[PDB]
Design a protein around this motif. Sequence first.
Motif, short mmCIF file in Angstrom:
data_model
loop_
_atom_site.label_atom_id
_atom_site.label_comp_id
_atom_site.label_asym_id
_atom_site.label_seq_id
_atom_site.Cartn_x
_atom_site.Cartn_y
_atom_site.Cartn_z
N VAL A 232 -4.38 -47.46 -2.87
CA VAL A 232 -3.14 -47.11 -2.39
C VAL A 232 -2.27 -48.45 -2.50
O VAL A 232 -2.43 -49.34 -1.76
N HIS B 272 -2.52 -44.90 -6.85
CA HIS B 272 -1.38 -44.29 -6.01
C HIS B 272 -0.48 -44.92 -5.45
O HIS B 272 -0.79 -46.24 -4.88
N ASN C 282 0.77 -37.15 -8.44
CA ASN C 282 0.30 -38.26 -9.36
C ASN C 282 1.32 -38.97 -10.09
O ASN C 282 1.58 -39.47 -11.34
N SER D 211 2.18 -36.10 -3.36
CA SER D 211 1.76 -37.33 -4.56
C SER D 211 0.52 -37.40 -4.70
O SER D 211 0.01 -37.81 -5.85
N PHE D 212 -0.37 -37.55 -3.52
CA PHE D 212 -1.85 -37.72 -3.55
C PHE D 212 -2.76 -36.57 -3.69
O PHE D 212 -3.49 -36.24 -4.35
#
Lengths: 406, 404
Positions: free
Chosen positions: B160, B258, B275, B298-299
């Motif tokens: 990340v 990410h 993503n 997002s993740f």
Amino acid sequence: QNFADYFQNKTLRVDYIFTGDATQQAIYLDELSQLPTWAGRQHHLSELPLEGNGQIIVKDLASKQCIYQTSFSSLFQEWLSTDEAKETAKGFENTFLLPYPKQPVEVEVTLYSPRKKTMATYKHIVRPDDILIHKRGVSHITPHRYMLQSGNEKDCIDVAILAEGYTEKEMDVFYQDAQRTCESLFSYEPFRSMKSKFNIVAVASPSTDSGVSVPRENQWKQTAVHSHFDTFYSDRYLTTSRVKSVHNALAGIPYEHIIILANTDVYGGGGIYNSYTLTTAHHPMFKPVVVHEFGHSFGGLADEYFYDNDVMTDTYPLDVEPWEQNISTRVNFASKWKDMLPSGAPIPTPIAEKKKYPVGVYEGGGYSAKGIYRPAYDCRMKTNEYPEFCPVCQRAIRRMIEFYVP
Amino acid sequence: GQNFADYFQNKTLRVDYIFTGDATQQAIYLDELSQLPTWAGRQHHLSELPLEGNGQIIVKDLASKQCIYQTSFSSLFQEWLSTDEAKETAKGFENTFLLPYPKQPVEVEVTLYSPRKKTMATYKHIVRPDDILIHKRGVSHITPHRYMLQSGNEKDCIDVAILAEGYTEKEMDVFYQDAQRTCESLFSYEPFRSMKSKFNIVAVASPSTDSGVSVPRENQWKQTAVHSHFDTFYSDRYLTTSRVKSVHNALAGIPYEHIIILANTDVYGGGGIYNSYTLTTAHHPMFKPVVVHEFGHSFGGLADEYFYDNDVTYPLDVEPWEQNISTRVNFASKWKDMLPSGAPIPTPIAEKKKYPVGVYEGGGYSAKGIYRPAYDCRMKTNEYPEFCPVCQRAIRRMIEFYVP
Ligand SMILES: [Cl-]
Ligand SMILES: [Cl-]
Ligand SMILES: [Cl-]
Ligand SMILES: [K+]
Ligand SMILES: [K+]
Ligand SMILES: [Zn+2]
Ligand SMILES: [Zn+2]
Ligand SMILES: [Zn+2]
Ligand SMILES: [Zn+2]
């Protein structure tokens, strides 16, 4: 048409994406921007100096009255004739400058084929109160220096010279290269006699790396406008497809035409009508080459040599009159230099008679030895070694300057 | 099982596309191919998806047409398609994806899906790994960065990246303090807390010319590292960036899967898309729970569980692909296996203590026809302390899918 009737003294900058392949094309809006002043035309607003291969027509939204017209050619249109365009659909950055409207406008972009056929068309409404019109050129204006300043941006043709591949440590070299550009340009007629119609500004846009990218050598450099060799897999073809980075570096400095200098001594570059000129500053033939390219990017002139060019594929159908003023297929010759051809001049003009005919109908030009004609035996649009523009190229350049400024 | 080395090199094939269209038509075009010096993504489950997403990228070996890599996502473009502007003006959007670098030519296929799972646009292109116009990146001038958490190598851990937005070089100590707060917040929540050793957290000090971020309605246009702005789709507090290439260019050469973008401001705003990236304001008082809610999107690919509509998605006759909401079209694919025998459907709000896992009406921006797994969750409110049990299971499945 008075400028103040529909426009503000600001620029409506439009960034588009030109997309497609060999079979289909389409245009999409990327973003609208504002520049603090209008550096372009104050007169001849609703007319064109040349057809170009592409046009932008601005209409008043309420009345649909045509209030601004501009023409161009694009790197995208060259790409469309390459091998890659037969298999992979791509998108290209294309930026245009329009006078900022007082009221809503309808903006229409059209791309034309070499046969003058409509390829793609796009219409969009711009509302001047739109908060998402990106304001630019108000802060961090790139350090710049006037190499020539004949007057204000309304009265003169503003040409910007931009630094590519020069680190902050190399800006004295860049400014010397800009002086050399100015000196070369104004050594040629009609630029020489019409010098007072121009402003020349050198824009010191810094690059992280010295030099430019050479993909075939696996030399990828981080530079101000991200130019590279190997364009369309043509080794010496140096271009940039990062057009927004070019215009972002120039935001806040008055400009109408762009000359990009690459910090290298190898051969390469090119110029495209109302796109930009990009050439290598330290190659030995820089002085005549930059002027040849400016012939394309500012003059909208064609190549007069009749040997095949790598990036130029099936560019001039023989049954169509080219829109370029210095070449003809003799389809509509009266629209060209027929009025400058002496009474009884032989057509084609025999090469043995070149001294008798400084203006003739010489077979060969526009990358073809037959069916295409040029106005003189030789010219700066034909060779780098000939000393001047031919008389028809000179008239065409005088017409461009007279069109843009009173 | 598919071995990574069979088709791929330990490098990244980065693809930048342009997603184009309006409310009636959509099309995809290639912008540019790039190479990154390492592959930070999956080594296993290469030809499968953890979620459907609203978009997919399928990589096939050119010679055999065997599927060798799959990835799914959602995009800012797909949100824009439902706005007023998309009804009148066709636009193009930057979209970047990371693929393992192939040993041999590949066929890459991108597909965008509607909320009804219908194909909107499809695009196929051949990538030849010896193509000289594949732009090499991440080999020089790598953005200064610092590891906030380093549990292991990029192959074994989920990488990340935390990126600085609106921080000048003079403000990077504040940014590194903010990246540390991000890591501290994330690992205070289950299952991230108990699966901490599965992650790498890198803070990337991407400099901005100006301090803060652009506010178009205030006529405040700033020059920043990733060119983020408020007033996205004319929604005042919607902070986004459509300059996706600038995000990935700043990260080139640092292993990442990410992205978390921190904006140097204390005002409310931001968002996360599956993503794509998370982008939020670092100094707003609710930063700690908000960044984790966005990372949920997002993740985790999780949906919003709140029933109220935004300033500006789920047809009631279609099962959403998101794991924490249901239209009860295909409820057995969701949390039916976690619902106690004889639980009332819908679960009454007065019986919330009896049912930590229920079928609560309201979620995915609708008070009726859409259901959520618990009365409250991190995906519903910023004030609730944790992810609901179904969001926690979904996040565990995402982590287990990406790393052994
Ligand atoms: Cl640079
Ligand atoms: Cl041209
Ligand atoms: Cl999402
Ligand atoms: K001017
Ligand atoms: K990883
Ligand atoms: Zn030429
Ligand atoms: Zn000529
Ligand atoms: Zn949310
Ligand atoms: Zn939940």
